[PDB]
From a paper:
The bacterial RNAP has a core consisting of β, β′, two α, and ω subunits (Cramer, 2002, Werner and Grohmann, 2011). The major variant sigma factor (σ54) forms a class on its own and controls stress-related gene expression, including heat shock, membrane stress, and nutrient starvation genes, thus playing important roles in bacterial adaptation and pathogenicity (Buck et al., 2000). σ54 brings RNAP to the promoter DNA through binding to consensus sequences at −12 and −24 and forms a stable closed complex that rarely isomerizes to an RPo. The activator proteins, which are also known as bacterial enhancer-binding proteins (bEBPs) and consist essentially of an AAA domain, use their ATPase activity to remodel the RPc into the RPo in order for transcription initiation to proceed (Ghosh et al., 2010, Schumacher et al., 2006). In this present work, using cryoelectron microscopy (cryo-EM) and single-particle analysis, we determined the structures of the RPc containing the promoter DNA from −35 to +28 with the characteristic fork junction structure of the RPc at −12/−11 (Guo and Gralla, 1998, Morris et al., 1994) and an intermediate complex (RPi) consisting of RNAP- σ54, the AAA domain of PspF (PspF1-275) in the presence of ADP.AlFx, and the promoter DNA.
Our work presented here uses such a DNA containing a mismatch at −12/−11. The promoter DNA, although at lower resolution, is clearly visible and sits above the cleft formed between the large β and β′ subunits (also known as pincers) of RNAP. In the RPc structure, the N-terminal RI of σ54, which is the main determinant in σ54 binding to the activator protein, interacts with the ELH of σ54 RIII, and together they form a barrier blocking DNA from entering the RNAP cleft for the RNA synthesis, in agreement with the previous crystal structure of RNAP-σ54 (Yang et al., 2015). The CBD interacts with β and β′ subunits as well as the very C-terminal tail of the σ54 RpoN domain in RPc, and importantly, the CBD would block the exit for newly synthesized RNA (Yang et al., 2015). The RpoN domain directly interacts with the −24 promoter DNA. In RPc, the σ54 RIII HTH interacts with DNA around −14. In RPc, the promoter DNA is bent between −24 and −12 and there are significant distortions downstream of −12 compared to standard B-DNA. Indeed, DNA is stretched with the minor groove widened to more than 25 Å and there is no clear density for a double-stranded DNA downstream of −9, suggesting a flexible nature of downstream DNA. There are direct interactions between the RI helix and both DNA strands downstream of −12, whereas HTH interacts with one of the strands in this region. Our structure here suggests that transcription bubble formation can be at least initiated outside the RNAP cleft in the RNAP-σ54 system.
Numbering used by the authors:
A (entry chain C): 1 to 1341
B (entry chain D): 253 to 254, 259 to 936, 947 to 955
């Protein structure tokens, strides 16, 4: 329908013939979903606080006959709000309620219960919540937790074979990883013996631990080994035949089967000789004795005549022993298979080498292996075996553990207990014995089917569960202390472990961090992030090979483009636009279902394992109206590769082509043309773009940014929109339409816009109204634009005029050249807001006073500071001026005549009080925004903060009184309506109150009902509004809780306007970023036939050098867009009729071949888009899809329609000399980027200043002093240069020498120009350290 | 270091004093052997915690987590004492600026922004106000500086002119990373740096920071003017050739300068010398024209201590005639007639330095920069969609290779060909087809363009900017252009083998999704490799630099008769390196001999340079005995005659110069040793008979 009432102001032109049926998801559902599932109440016991309370509860003391049952929990409303809480600067957290119930059991009496204990809730900890945008609040910070990627718990099939073993064979291993607790792994050695390593401890044989599982050798061999049969009697000595159980043989003699030889001596072992004795029916045959010496007995057979232990299982048989066994009365003997073709003699070396044959000695041996210091006492070994191996608390599998456990073991059951079992680990050892046998496939570590993501829900559940156990220990000891505890859940539960665990977790963690805010882009792509750092997933911070590579599982879920190009590469990832998280943590991406020859519109979400078997067609392919594929052979992918397949082999579809990219790199137009490396660089440079004064929507674009800007939460959107009444920059109100409303409470929705405010990146943010007044608003319309947003469409940079040319060598390599025009148009200018706060107080000499006196300073500061208060709002603070005066007490001294007259003439503070204040260090200057200060508990006698205490009251009463006027006024008009026909009079009612003395009497019913009702809701709304105003005022006058280490906190905002600067930096969307050499005047710029000097000058060499394609098509297509907008602007200058311009606008929309459903003029044709022509008169909003973007045919056809030369090259004349350059020159308009790399912030030039007490070296940068560093490479550079004096006075005089700096400086000021080598003090520090060591050093002459 | 408690020290001393006074008190109490034994083990563990911590007990500090610091951590801050001592201290007087490029001013200069000025020079400004006496008291002069008086700027100008400033980039590799320039003030917050030196520092304009240090007084400024100047040291003691980078707009500008064209404008020209001003700047004469009769004067340096003039008519172009005005004096004119790429422009400066001296190649290279940027801007070079050319044979080659591979997989379906031989076979067909698309690409790159004059079949070479960069060599390569138009090749990071699904789409054409997946795969592998090689390179430079620190190079002449024989490598069909570059330099033991005997060419040891060595190139001698290092010489160090004259100064080398520190930076000079490690017979053919 493409109605787009909110987008009717600017209609972005769409390209490409590939339709998108699946709409863009809300895309924050990872953090929003994780949070809403972290706080929930469900009977199913979903993972969260209820799962933790159900996990730990019931809490029963040891031999205490007392239990604690969980009432679960319910969350309440926080005391503060989002915005007000961030303004106060305190962490935002809701209390927890619904405490657990207790229980008491009678001692020595079974089932006896004196009473049931049900107690009121108790305050425990603080549970932080999430803002609607997906952030958190701690101490007034944004606090977002990065998503994590970890190994999914389950059986791992690993190889670990290669040149690292150097054994000449391929090793194999497998390890079960629980969600918590110790790890259990198996390890091969070249001896081919299965070993067991538990949590890096020395690997014991399999027979000692499996013996600790209480399985005798008979069950070992008879379980994990074959049986068959053996027959010794009558001297025939015959065995059964298993022709289908083995392929192979070794025959040194003939073997006859039923009177005929099946395989002759030395005859071929081939299937011709196999099937001869296989397909035919053959029974047990007699063999010679010599084959027994190689065979191994299976079961345990002992002589029946006497009680010796001879002929034990798992032992070699002796030719002389056959006479002792066969004559003992044993007719049949079970012997092991023991023939190596597809099998091997595993576990035998474990049985032979394993010293412990019993489970008790096995438990003692594994106990001694666990604890080297203390010999085992044999008493706790039984608990160490279960608690170490199979136990409820110390072993955790649950949903993913048992799932990937069974599916990894090829088991039928998909669910089970969260604990290990003997048959389970025996099955793992069996499948591992098969992997060692050579059958079966291994698993890849980088394969995301073995990977799972963890979020705020699972993480916070883990830490909160650990803290809950830490509470369970002390509560268990408390209940075990006393025999009978009445009303136990009162003082037993301490909130310090809870609030310390959750406040320490969200407070300080590697994953939880504050964001540096530049544009909504960095906020949303910083909101969605995958991290392999933190706990797990991190081996080392140096080198690495296979972990940082790209697996085929990285196609439709994680974006290979976006990445931390810095020291750690390939670790931090970004999910796809359409990527979704499964309930078990797996990453599923959409695929459109296809049935027979028609493509069905049903969407199916497939994981890596599910999509591995199915075949999915290429993203871009020919499509027909009937649904069938035009081309017979369609490119399709199955597993790890792609090839042409028939139309019947395609199961699914890739839907949109944007699934492989992320939101950060998906906004870069013409991605298929530009190289992946420079696209990676540009995508890495999209986050650092600082918002400027005014945002101009990109005229070359994608169209995903439309959804990114509205879904980022930065812009101010409207809820249940309607006809707007009042508009303003501070506030916006909307009268809601009466179509869909709740019948109660009446009222309208009010909004408060955020003005200039400091961010974590020291940038500036604001929201501005997009509408004038009286304009209706639908649901989802953006009312106000945030920083770097224009009309709800994301613009984080500014376009400007572009021409490709070297100019007098000023543009070299990637260096950039900017005209003074854009410098003087205020473009690219940004505001940096720094906050300064001086907080000390807390003196044992008495409290500190703020301002009211400035000692040892003239009236210059007293003119800026108020008498009873601080400086005026929006003043000029330059240099070391004192922004806030402060005085601190000093120690008392004797009076004496001197200080007596000094205190008599001085008076007031007596001048003995120190001058320490908030004064700003040098190098910082600007205008102040607002001073928020602070208010303590029970503090008074201060004129400060009174202006904000009154301002918040006048604001809350100002915006709160509007609803009171709408309510009291609406019900008042309802009184004027109900008084009709009861003795009404317009002339009387429109000139008097009470409305006829409360509608008079009339027909009695209206008297008491209408009058008593009018008084009822009249006093109800009046007194209710007054009560709400008082409750709101108390929150304003109560303040916040400051740390005890200060009486009063003062904090001041300051803002600075920084503008396009020569050093600076500038970036493109395709990865080209450079510093500006110099800013040239307008007269020196080349101009076209119309006399339009060029704004920017870049280097064409970077296109072939750095392999950047997209810049050319960007500039040319942008030149076409500004050509259309230039012609429409000319039409507005000519004041043409609506229809004449309407024709060119319609042709502009529908030109080309299809590639859209849009039709101009479709809505009323006389307004809206007709005014949108005057909106886009500056430029045409042309969009291109990521991989579906425009082609040079449509670029040359559109740009040719824009009257511009089809070649995209315009004859230019030199600016300085007026001469024409040889050959045509490429000009265009591209999207540019302002960055935080500006030289005012980066560069600090330091000479001499304060130093460090150790080695007497300077501290470093930002301290106003310091020499940066010239390291050992510079020492080597000077040694190679041959000048030893620069290193002499550089390494010693200007650093270590204490007297060399004073004498050297005295020689520079005096002009002697002489220095001495001196004695380095850092060498003396080495002397002192070694002297502190037990080794003595003393210098000689 | 404040809550203070004196961490990492007092935490240990309180425990050790606690156990000492505890064992003394219990010692006076006569505690049992178990109590005093526990006091003795906690005692030895406590003093252990003092001297060496983290080896066994790993005692943790207060806030636990990270083990507490001990004396072992006090000796070595991170690795060794390099942080505290024996390596670079923070020192003083540092700008820490951002790179910019001035095209103007001088090869050795500086753009210390005014903002940067007078902040570092404060002591010299106070002393100047003292000696000159414009101020009264010290605090009054400090007030004159802090009040931003305009009078201070004149004295500041007096100081800055002759006061040099040395510049460095933080990742310093070789000796030329730190140089000495003569600063001049430019309004701004940045530093405009000489473009030719930017590639010498390897620094880029992406915004990497820069270190600015101030030398002090006599040996610093004077040794920096006599040593550390960028023009004083040009020859790099690594490759042996002078290191200058007249690339980018210099190669493009001089390539558009030197070239010919059929017809066009101007035809022939009778005027010769002053044809650039009137002919070029007036009208009627193109910047470059073929068949110009303009005479040109020559200067013959063959005479001893004297230059012999000459004049002759040589076939050339207008742009080459303009370029010859830059070439000083006695250089031959045959050097400027060529395509004049990034290579040919080097040997020009080489022969200029090794004939006319250092000043003519300094002012000459500098003027090469000026004319290169100037005529580069006047060239009007650019790039666009129509600039690149897509060959029409690419479709037939891709279709033919697709048919052949279809027959290959047909043979695999029939079972006649194995999967491995079919795999490598398909790789061979797509490789050969890629070569075909490359050759057709080149054909349409040069011979596609036509110009109509006379018989019209002569035309001319294509003027496209992509081709000017390919042949000129300012940037790009035939392989990168092959990625622009022709096939991109095939690589797989996880597998390490060539994939069976080639990429048939040019950059101008829309790339497939999976093609982009493979491209970002191999690109990510490339970023991992290039990011990985830096640490190993710096570590190798650390090892070799630590091993080579020993050479004093003290004595002048040892006078040893032992030497190493010098013969060419002669590997393969053609020799890899000639005999000249290897034999030149050092000194020769005994003397070389012609086919006639009894005659010696050189008097025992001689310094081999462009004269003597080229005289040896005219003879038939294939082997030259050359005495060098590791052969005899001294007990510690090497005499000057074994190393040779190769250095920034091409004359000789003198006592005291350390070749060990200069060494290891030629091997460790490349930042990236290799990329991908290059993915790692019966007939004998020879080039000549």
């Amino acid at each position: 329908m493409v109605y787009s009432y909110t987008e009717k102001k600017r209609i972005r032109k769409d390209f490409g013939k590939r339709p998108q049926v699946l709409d863009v998801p809300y895309l924050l559902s990872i953090q929003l979903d994780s949070f809403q599932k972290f706080i929930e109440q469900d009977p199913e016991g979903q993972y969260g606080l209820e799962a933790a309370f159900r996990s730990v509860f019931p809490i029963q003391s040891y031999s205490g006959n007392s239990e604690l049952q969980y009432v679960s929990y319910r969350l309440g409303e926080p005391v503060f709000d989002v915005q007000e809480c961030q303004i106060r600067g305190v962490t935002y957290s809701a209390p927890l309620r619904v405490k657990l119930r207790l229980v008491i059991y009678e001692r020595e009496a079974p089932e006896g219960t004196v009473k049931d204990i049900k107690e009121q809730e108790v305050y425990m900890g603080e549970i932080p919540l999430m803002t609607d945008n997906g952030t958190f609040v701690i101490n007034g910070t944004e606090r977002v937790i990065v998503s994590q990627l970890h190994r999914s718990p389950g059986v791992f099939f690993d190889s670990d074979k290669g040149k690292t073993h150097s054994s000449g064979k391929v090793l194999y291993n497998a390890r079960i990883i629980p969600y918590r607790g110790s790890w259990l792994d198996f390890e091969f050695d070249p001896k081919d013996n299965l070993f067991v390593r538990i949590d890096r401890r020395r690997k014991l044989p399999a027979t000692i631990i499996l013996r600790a599982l209480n399985y005798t050798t008979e069950q070992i061999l008879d379980l994990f080994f074959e049986k068959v049969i053996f027959e010794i009697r009558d001297n025939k000595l015959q065995m059964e035949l298993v022709p289908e159980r083995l392929r192979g043989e070794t025959a040194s003699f003939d073997i006859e089967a039923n009177g005929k030889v099946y395989v002759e001596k030395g005859r071929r072992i081939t299937a011709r000789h196999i099937r001869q004795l296989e397909k035919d029916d053959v029974k047990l045959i007699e063999v010679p004795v010599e084959y027994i010496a190689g065979k191994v007995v299976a079961k345990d057979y002992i002589d029946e005549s006497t009680g010796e232990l001879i002929c034990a299982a798992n032992m070699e048989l002796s030719l002389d022993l056959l006479a002792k066994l066969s004559q003992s009365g044993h007719k049949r003997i079970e012997t092991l298979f023991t023939n190596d073709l597809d099998h091997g003699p595993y576990i035998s070396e474990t049985l032979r080498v394993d010293p412990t044959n019993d489970r008790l000695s096995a438990l003692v041996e594994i106990y001694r292996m666990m604890r080297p210091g203390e010999p085992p006492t044999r008493e706790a070994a039984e608990s160490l075996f279960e608690n170490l191996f199979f136990s409820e608390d110390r072993y955790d599998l649950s949903a993913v553990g048992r799932m990937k456990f069974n599916r990894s073991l090829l088991r039928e059951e998909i669910e089970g207990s969260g604990i290990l079992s003997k048959d389970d680990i025996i099955d793992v050892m069996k499948k591992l014995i098969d992997i060692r046998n050579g059958k079966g496939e291994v698993d890849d570590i980088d394969h995301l089917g073995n990977r799972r993501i963890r979020s705020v829900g699972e993480m916070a559940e883990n830490q909160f569960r650990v803290g809950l156990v830490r509470v369970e220990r002390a509560v268990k000891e408390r209940l075990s202390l006393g025999d009978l505890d009445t009303l136990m859940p009162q003082d037993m539960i301490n909130a310090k472990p809870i609030s310390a665990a959750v406040k320490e977790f969200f407070g300080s963690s590697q994953l939880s961090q504050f964001m540096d805010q530049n544009n909504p882009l960095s906020e949303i792509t910083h909101k969605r992030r995958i991290s392999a750092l933190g706990p797990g997933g991190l081996t080392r911070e140096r080198a690495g090979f296979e972990v940082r590579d790209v697996h085929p599982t990285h196609y439709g879920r994680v974006c290979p483009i976006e990445t931390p190009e810095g020291p750690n590469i390939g670790l931090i990832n970004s999910l796809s636009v359409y990527a979704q998280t499964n309930e078990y943590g797996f990453l599923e991406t959409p695929y459109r279902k296809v049935t027979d020859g028609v493509v069905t519109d049903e969407i199916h979400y497939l994981s890596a394992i599910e999509e591995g078997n199915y075949v999915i067609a290429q993203a871009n392919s020919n499509l027909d109206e009937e649904g069938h594929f035009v081309e017979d052979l369609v490119t399709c992918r199955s597993k790890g590769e792609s090839s042409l397949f028939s139309r019947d082999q395609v199961d699914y579809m890739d839907v949109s082509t944007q699934q492989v990219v992320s939101v950060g790199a998906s906004l870069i137009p013409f991605l298929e043309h530009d190289d992946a490396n420079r696209a990676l660089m540009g995508a890495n440079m999209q986050r650092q773009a600082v918002p400027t004064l005014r945002a101009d929507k990109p005229l070359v674009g994608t169209g995903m940014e439309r959804a990114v800007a509205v879904d980022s939460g930065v812009t101010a959107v409207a809820k249940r929109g309607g006809v707007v009444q009042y508009v303003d920059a501070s506030r916006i109100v909307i009268k809601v339409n009466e179509d869909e409303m709740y019948p109660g409470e009446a009222g309208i929705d009010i909004y408060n816009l955020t003005k200039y405010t400091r961010s974590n990146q020291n940038t500036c943010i604001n929201q501005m109204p997009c509408v004038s007044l009286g304009e209706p608003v639908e649901r989802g319309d953006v009312l106000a634009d945030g920083p770097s947003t224009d009309l709800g469409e994301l613009a984080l940079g500014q376009n400007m005029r572009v021409a490709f040319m070297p100019w007098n060598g000023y543009n070299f390599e990637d260096s950039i050249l900017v005209s003074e025009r854009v410098v003087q148009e205020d473009r690219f200018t940004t505001i940096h807001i720094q906050e300064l706060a001086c907080v000390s107080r807390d003196t044992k000499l008495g409290p500190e006073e703020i301002t009211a006196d400035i000692p040892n300073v003239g009236e210059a500061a007293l003119s800026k500071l108020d008498e009873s208060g601080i400086v005026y709002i929006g003043a000029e603070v330059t240099g070391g001026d004192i922004l806030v005066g402060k005085v601190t007490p000093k120690g008392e001294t004797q009076l004496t005549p001197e200080e007596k007259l000094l205190r008599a003439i001085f008076g007031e503070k007596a001048s003995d009080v120190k001058d320490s204040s908030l004064r700003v260090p040098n190098g910082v200057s600007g205008t102040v925004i607002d001073v928020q200060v602070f208010t303590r508990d029970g503090v008074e006698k201060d004129k400060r903060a009174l202006e904000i205490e009154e301002m918040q009251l006048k604001q809350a009463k100002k915006d709160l009184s509007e609803e009171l006027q709408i309510l009291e006024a609406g019900l008042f008009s309802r009184i004027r309506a109900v008084l009709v026909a009861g003795g009404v009079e317009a002339e009387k009612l429109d000139k008097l109150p009470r409305d006829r003395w409360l509608e008079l009497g009339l027909t009695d019913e209206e008297k008491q009902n209408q009058l008593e009702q009018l008084a009822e809701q009249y006093d109800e709304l009046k007194h209710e509004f007054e009560k709400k105003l008082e409750a709101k005022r108390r929150k304003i006058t109560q303040g916040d809780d400051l740390a005890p280490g200060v009486l009063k906190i003062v904090k001041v905002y300051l803002a600075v306007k920084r503008r396009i600067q020569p050093g600076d930096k500038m970036a493109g969307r395709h990865g080209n970023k450079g510093v500006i050499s110099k800013i040239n005047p307008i007269e020196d710029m080349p101009y076209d036939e119309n006399g339009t000097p060029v704004d920017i000058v870049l280097n064409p060499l970077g296109v072939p050098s750095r392999m950047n394609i997209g810049q050319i098509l960007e500039t040319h297509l942008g030149m076409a867009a500004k050509g259309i907008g230039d012609k429409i602007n000319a039409m507005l200058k000519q004041q043409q009729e609506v229809a004449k311009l309407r024709e060119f606008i319609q042709r502009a929309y529908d030109l080309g071949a299809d590639v859209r459903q849009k039709v101009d003029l479709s809505t009323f044709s006389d307004e809206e888009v007709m005014r949108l022509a005057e909106n886009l008169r500056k430029g045409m909003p042309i969009a291109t899809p990521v991989f579906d973007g425009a082609k040079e045919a449509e670029i040359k056809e559109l740009l040719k329609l824009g009257d511009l030369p089809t070649s995209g090259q315009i004859r230019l004349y030199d600016g300085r000399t007026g001469e024409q350059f040889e050959r045509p020159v490429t000009v265009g308009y591209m999207y540019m980027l302002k960055l935080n790399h500006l030289v005012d912030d980066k560069m600090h030039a330091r000479s001499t200043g304060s130093y460090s007490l150790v080695t007497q070296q300077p501290l470093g940068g930002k301290a106003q002093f310091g020499g940066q560093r010239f390291g050992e490479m510079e020492v080597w550079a000077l040694e190679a240069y041959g000048a030893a004096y620069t290193l002499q006075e550089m390494l010693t005089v200007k650093s270590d020498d204490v007297n060399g700096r004073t004498k050297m400086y005295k020689n520079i000021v005096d002009g002697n120009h002489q220095m001495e080598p001196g004695m380095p003090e850092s060498f003396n520090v080495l002397l002192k350290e070694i002297r502190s060591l037990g080794i003595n050093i003393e210098l000689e002459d | 270091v404040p809550r203070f408690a004196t961490s990492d020290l007092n935490d240990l001393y309180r425990r050790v004093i606690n156990r000492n006074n505890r064992l003394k008190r219990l010692l006076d109490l006569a505690a049992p052997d178990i109590i005093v034994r526990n006091e003795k083990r906690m005692l030895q563990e406590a003093v252990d915690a003092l001297l060496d911590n983290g080896r066994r007990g790993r005692a943790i500090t207060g806030s636990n987590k990270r083990p507490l610091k001990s004396l072992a951590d006090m000796i070595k801050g991170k690795q060794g004492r390099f942080r505290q001592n024996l390596l670079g201290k923070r020192v003083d007087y540092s700008g820490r600026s951002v790179i910019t490029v001035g095209p103007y001013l001088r090869l050795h200069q500086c753009g210390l922004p005014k903002k940067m000025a007078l902040e570092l020079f404060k002591p010299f400004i106070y002393g100047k106000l003292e000696l000159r006496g414009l101020a009264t008291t010290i605090k009054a002069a400090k007030k004159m500086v802090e009040r931003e008086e305009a009078v201070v700027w004149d004295i500041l100008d007096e100081v800055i002119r002759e006061h040099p400033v040395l510049l460095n980039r933080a990742p310093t590799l070789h000796r030329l990373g730190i140089q000495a320039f003569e600063p001049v003030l430019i309004e701004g917050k940045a530093i405009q740096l000489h473009p030719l030196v930017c590639a010498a520092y390897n620094a880029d304009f992406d915004g990497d920071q820069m270190a600015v240090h101030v030398p002090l007084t006599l040996e610093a400024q004077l040794e920096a003017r006599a040593l550390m100047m960028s023009t004083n040291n040009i020859l790099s003691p690594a490759n042996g050739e002078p290191i200058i980078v007249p690339s980018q707009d210099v190669v493009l500008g001089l390539y558009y300068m030197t070239r010919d064209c059929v017809n066009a404008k101007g035809e022939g020209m009778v005027l010769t010398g002053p044809k650039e001003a009137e002919r070029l700047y007036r009208s009627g004469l193109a910047s470059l024209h073929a068949r110009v009769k303009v005479r040109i004067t020559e200067y013959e340096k063959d005479a001893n201590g004297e230059l012999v003039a000459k004049t002759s008519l040589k076939d050339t172009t207008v742009g080459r005639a303009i370029l010859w005005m830059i070439v000083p004096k006695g250089l031959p004119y045959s050097i400027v007639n060529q395509a004049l790429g990034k290579k040919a422009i080097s040997k020009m400066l080489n022969t200029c330095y090794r004939i006319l001296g250092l000043k003519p190649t300094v002012i000459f290279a500098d003027q090469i920069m000026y004319t290169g940027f100037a005529y580069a801007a006047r060239s009007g070079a650019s790039v666009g969609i129509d600039d690149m050319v897509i060959p029409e044979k690419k479709h037939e080659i891709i279709s033919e290779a697709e048919a052949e591979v279809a027959e290959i997989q047909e043979q695999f379906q029939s079972g006649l060909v194995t999967a491995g031989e079919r795999y490598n076979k398909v790789i061979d067909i797509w490789a050969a087809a890629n070569d075909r698309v490359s050759k057709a690409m080149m054909d349409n790159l040069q011979t596609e363009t036509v110009i109509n004059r006379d018989g019209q079949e002569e035309k001319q070479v294509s003027f496209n900017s992509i081709y000017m960069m390919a042949d000129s060599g300012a940037r790009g390569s035939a392989a990168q252009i092959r990625q622009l138009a022709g096939m991109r090749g095939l690589m797989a990071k996880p597998d390490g083998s060539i994939i069976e699904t080639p990429i048939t789409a040019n950059f101008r054409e829309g790339l497939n999704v999976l093609q982009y997946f493979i491209s970002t795969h191999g690109a990510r592998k490339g970023l991992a490799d290039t990011a990985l090689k830096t640490a190993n390179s710096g570590y190798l430079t650390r090892r070799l630099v630590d091993v080579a620190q020993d050479l004093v190079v003290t004595e002048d002449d040892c006078g040893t008769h032992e030497g190493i024989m010098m013969t060419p490598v002669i590997e393969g069909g053609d020799v890899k390196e000639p005999l000249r570059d290897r034999v030149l330099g050092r000194v020769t033991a005994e003397d070389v001999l012609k086919p006639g005997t009894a005659d010696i060419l050189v008097p025992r040891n001689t310094l081999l340079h462009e004269q003597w060595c080229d005289l040896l190139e005219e003879n038939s001698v294939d082997a030259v005995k050359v005495r060098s290092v590791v052969s005899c010489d001294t007990d510690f160090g090497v005499c000057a005659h074994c190393y040779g004259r190769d250095l920034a100064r091409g004359h000789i080398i003198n006592k005291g110069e350390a070749i060990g520190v200069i060494a290891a930076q030629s091997i460790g000079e490349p930042g990236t040793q290799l990329t991908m490690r290059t993915f790692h017979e019966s007939s004998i053919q020879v080039k000549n008979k």
